[PDB]
């Protein structure tokens, strides 16, 4: 705290409470007692705990029928209008698409749709496999995800 | 019809004004006027201005008929205090409270 280390009054004599800094945390406009610093809130996850979780989420998504496997999910033009349609016939509104290829046409077409997320089968995570109502995976993508979780 | 006149930030202290207000509480407004006229206080000159204004506030706006008016409510609140400094002996300083007040006369037929 910006201030001087001058003791505000003397220690004895004046009938005030004893103080020794204008920046003490008892005082107004000086000092947080245990002040924050920027910290790392990351946690360590074991790989067999991370892979055991994802194997246990994908096992539960076929239990509550929220995993739907497709064999291809592409869209011809990189247009949000077509994908907005690609999911009405599929009867989807809040969905996570997980593909194996690098489809940038499909990737842009869901960049504006809020409840639709497109991944690349390598960045699927805990919170994304849970916070979407349906998870739709292309058949080339579920081959890779089965592999990395052994 | 209750007719209010106020005098806000009256420069007399509220305890000094409340002494004069208890003289004209409930009196008929003609008898209340010459109680305040032969009362030798500074608050008597202040309160009489509000009562003479509530007398005209009644007969100009709400109606007429001075002679059946009565000082029904009369109450003095404490306004904001102006804080001043009196220097005392041996470097010491004190706080002077220039105490304002809020005089409210409610006249009523």
């Amino acid at each position: 705290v910006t201030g001087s280390g001058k003791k505000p009054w003397r220690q004895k004599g004046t009938g005030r409470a004893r103080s020794g800094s204008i920046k003490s945390p008892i005082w107004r406009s000086g000092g947080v007692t245990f002040a924050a610093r920027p910290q790392d809130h990351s946690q360590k996850v074991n790989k067999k705990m991370y892979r055991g979780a994802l194997k246990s989420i994908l096992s539960e998504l076929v239990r509550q029928d929220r995993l739907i496997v497709v064999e291809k999910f592409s869209v011809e033009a990189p247009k949000t209008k077509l994908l907005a349609q690609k999911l009405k016939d599929m009867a989807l509104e809040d969905v996570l698409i997980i593909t194996g290829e690098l489809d940038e046409n499909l990737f842009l077409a869901a960049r504006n749709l809020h409840k639709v997320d497109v991944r690349d089968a390598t960045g699927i995570d805990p919170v994304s496999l849970i916070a979407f109502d349906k998870v739709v995976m292309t058949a080339d993508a579920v081959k890779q995800v089965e592999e990395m979780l052994a | 019809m209750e007719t209010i006149a106020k005098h806000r930030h009256a420069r007399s202290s509220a305890q000094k004004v409340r002494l004069v207000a208890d003289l004209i509480r409930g009196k008929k407004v003609s008898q209340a006027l010459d109680i305040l006229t032969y009362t030798n206080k500074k608050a008597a000159v202040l309160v009489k201005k509000v009562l003479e204004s509530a007398i005209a506030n009644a007969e100009h706006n709400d109606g007429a008929d001075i002679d059946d008016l009565k000082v029904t409510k009369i109450f003095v609140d404490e306004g904001p205090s102006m804080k001043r400094i009196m220097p005392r002996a041996k470097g010491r300083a004190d706080r002077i409270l220039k105490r304002t007040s809020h005089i409210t006369v409610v006249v009523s037929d």
């Binding site: 009054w9 004599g13 004046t14 009938g15 | 804080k83 041996k90 470097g91 010491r92």
Partner: peptide, 26 residues
Amino acid sequence: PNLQPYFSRCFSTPVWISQAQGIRAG
């Protein structure tokens, strides 16, 4: 002028250094 531009704190403490008579022993 009903504007109220008041003043502030305008000096510190002179002395609390004060009288000291009174003992029970020396």
